[PDB]
């Protein structure tokens, strides 16, 4: 099916507690495979997935140089943005960067991404053309002009259409037994009386991968979006995810409710009901 690779950079200043910390993590779909933390005793790129361990010393050294240099550059960037917003040197701030490539089911590039935020708010983003920028405010425009003068977009594009796609395909092959394996959700419905005239019906989805899933409740065939409590998909810790959807129903009307599950691991959407 479709796949993506993403790197997530977080640079956080902390006046009075040393220089800004830089953390980078890499993912292929919902599987993390690498990490770098400038606060580590001996900062170095480390593997976080079995299939990346086979990469040679050159790979790890290359990664580490990139992250070490980025660590320093983001410290300058944090100083620069503090100034762009006329902020004091007393506060802590964060710059985040999220970038990567999306591939279609045939392995071809669908599109690239390169977005950045400051203190959790969108700051500047590379447009889908991988050639122009969208700045959120007059501060981001300074960065935009600096990046346009340095022809930065061209560098991002070269990477997104080149090495990003090439290495993602390599990872997909080396870790095909997991990365290209969709584990369907194990589903069931639980019943929990709340009072004499109401009961909670909870639809469970466990052990699925990837995280993308659609879990909904229907009453007489009509979606109960407004009356459904849907928790955020959560990691189990074994690579899989979990999720549940619940609805409070009138006692005795349980059979009018159906839970529907959609997941890549499922050839056809599933329909479940409470089974006393």
């Amino acid at each position: 099916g479709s796949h993506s690779m993403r790197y997530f950079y977080t640079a956080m200043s902390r006046p009075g507690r040393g220089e800004p910390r830089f953390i980078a993590v890499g993912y292929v779909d919902d599987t993390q495979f690498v990490r770098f933390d400038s606060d580590a005793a001996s900062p170095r790129t480390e593997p976080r997935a079995p299939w990346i361990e086979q990469e040679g010393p050159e790979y790890w050294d290359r990664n580490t140089q990139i992250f070490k240099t980025n660590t320093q550059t983001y410290r300058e960037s944090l100083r620069n943005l503090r100034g762009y917003y006329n902020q004091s040197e007393a506060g802590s701030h964060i710059i985040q960067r999220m970038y990567g490539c999306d591939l279609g089911p045939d392995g071809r590039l669908l599109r690239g991404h390169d977005q950045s935020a400051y203190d959790g708010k969108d700051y500047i983003a590379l447009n889908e053309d991988l050639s122009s920028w969208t700045a959120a405010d007059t501060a981001a425009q300074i960065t935009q002009r600096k990046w346009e003068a340095a022809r930065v977009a061209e560098q991002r594009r070269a990477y997104l259409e080149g090495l990003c796609v090439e290495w993602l395909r390599r990872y997909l092959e080396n870790g095909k037994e997991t990365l290209q394996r969709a584990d369907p959700p194990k589903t069931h419905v639980t019943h929990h009386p709340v009072s004499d005239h109401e009961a909670t019906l909870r639809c469970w989805a466990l052990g699925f991968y990837p995280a993308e899933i659609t879990l909904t409740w229907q009453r007489d065939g009509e979606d109960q979006t407004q009356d459904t409590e849907l928790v955020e998909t959560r990691p189990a810790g074994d690579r899989t995810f979990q999720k549940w959807a619940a609805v409070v129903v009138p006692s005795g009307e349980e059979q009018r409710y159906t839970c529907h599950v959609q997941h890549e691991g499922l050839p056809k959407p599933l329909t479940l009901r409470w089974e006393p």
Binding site: T10, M12, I23, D119, G120, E232, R234, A236, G237, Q242
Partner: protein, 99 residues
């Protein structure tokens, strides 16, 4: 502005009294990234709790998974204690095997 963390406390595998499992505390949707998370057993802090590497969602909010091995019983109570700049006091979420 800042965003307060969403908190979920749950087990990796279906809870079976007397059987080893993993207790998880998933904090997400928060900003900034600094956050303190403790896993509790009968009110006491569990030592050696591990956590995932800092990452974030499309809306830039952060998420982290804290976890530790644990053996569910009928009496023992488990919970997650979270503190964040957006919280005036630590937030306690008890583990409910049905949630």
């Amino acid at each position: 502005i800042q965003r307060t963390p969403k908190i979920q406390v749950y087990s990796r595998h279906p809870a079976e009294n007397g059987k080893s499992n993993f207790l998880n505390c998933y904090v997400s949707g928060f900003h900034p990234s600094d956050i303190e998370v403790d896993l509790l057993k009968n009110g006491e802090r569990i030592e050696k709790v591990e956590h995932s590497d800092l990452s974030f969602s499309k809306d830039w909010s952060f998420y982290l998974l804290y976890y530790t091995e644990f053996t569910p019983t009928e009496k023992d109570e488990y919970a997650c204690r979270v503190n964040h700049v957006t919280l005036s006091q630590p937030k306690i979420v008890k583990w409910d095997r049905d949630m």
